[PDB]
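Sequence, please.
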């Protein structure tokens, strides 16, 4: 996250870190046994880390649970990043409390102008590299589809939305991928892609979760 603020420990209780020896992507806890992330975060050998603030220090609220199954969306296209969504089942259920909690799925799609919260452990610089150890947060609005398509001609599908600031300065970045965009207490987006971080006229692009609720619910019910 570029241009954000330190969230505070366990203030984003649905945020997870995906770990393969190191943090590589975010995700969101949607019930005691399932996480949703980006398909472009797929790899084998995922450990899900819940209850994290500092990802390099054991602070006492962590739960570390290995994945038993990963399910990339049937129509994910790695060239265009259309359908950039994946489900991860945990080998055992997490223990839910105030500091480790699920986030609700949306019943309706959020409109442009809605303010959302984006969070992650990704790069904090637009030029160069500095990775934080504690969770960073950013408040940002959903942009109109017309502004999003104007920023990225030929690249925005109905399964994507833009959020952020056309003036630049504040954005998600590498290492935030897979993490949550929460608006009005519901999971509306997944950090997906963009051109660089925090550049003028190049806002972040997010997977539009409201288009996937039926797939999520049916997949969880049968796996
Ligand atoms: N600035 C949006 C973004 C770029 C690369 C990875 C994740 C997010
Ligand atoms: Ca920790």
């Amino acid at each position: 996250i570029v241009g954000g603020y330190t969230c505070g420990a366990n203030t984003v209780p649905y945020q997870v870190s995906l770990n393969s020896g190191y943090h590589f992507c975010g995700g969101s806890l949607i019930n005691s046994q399932w996480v949703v992330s980006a398909a472009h975060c797929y790899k084998s050998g995922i450990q899900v880390r819940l209850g994290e603030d500092n990802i390099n220090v054991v602070e006492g609220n962590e739960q570390f649970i290995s994945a038993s199954k990963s399910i990339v969306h049937p129509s994910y296209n790695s060239n265009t990043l259309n359908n950039d969504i994946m489900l991860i089942k945990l080998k055992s259920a997490a223990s839910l409390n105030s500091r480790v909690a699920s986030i609700s799925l949306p019943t309706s799609c959020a409109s442009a102008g809605t303010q959302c919260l984006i969070s992650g452990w990704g790069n904090t610089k637009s030029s160069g590299t500095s990775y934080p150890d504690v969770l960073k947060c950013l408040k940002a609005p959903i942009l109109s589809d017309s502004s999003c398509k104007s920023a990225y001609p030929g690249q925005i599908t109905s399964n994507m939305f833009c959020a952020g600031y056309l003036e630049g300065g504040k954005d998600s970045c590498q290492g935030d991928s897979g993490g949550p965009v929460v608006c009005s207490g519901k999971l509306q987006g997944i950090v997906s892609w963009g051109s660089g971080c925090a550049q003028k006229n190049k806002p972040g692009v997010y997977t539009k979760v409201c288009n996937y609720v039926s797939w999520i619910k049916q997949t969880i019910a049968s796996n």
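The pocket of calcium ion (ligand 2) is lined by residues 52, 54-55, 57-59, 62 (CB under 6 Å).
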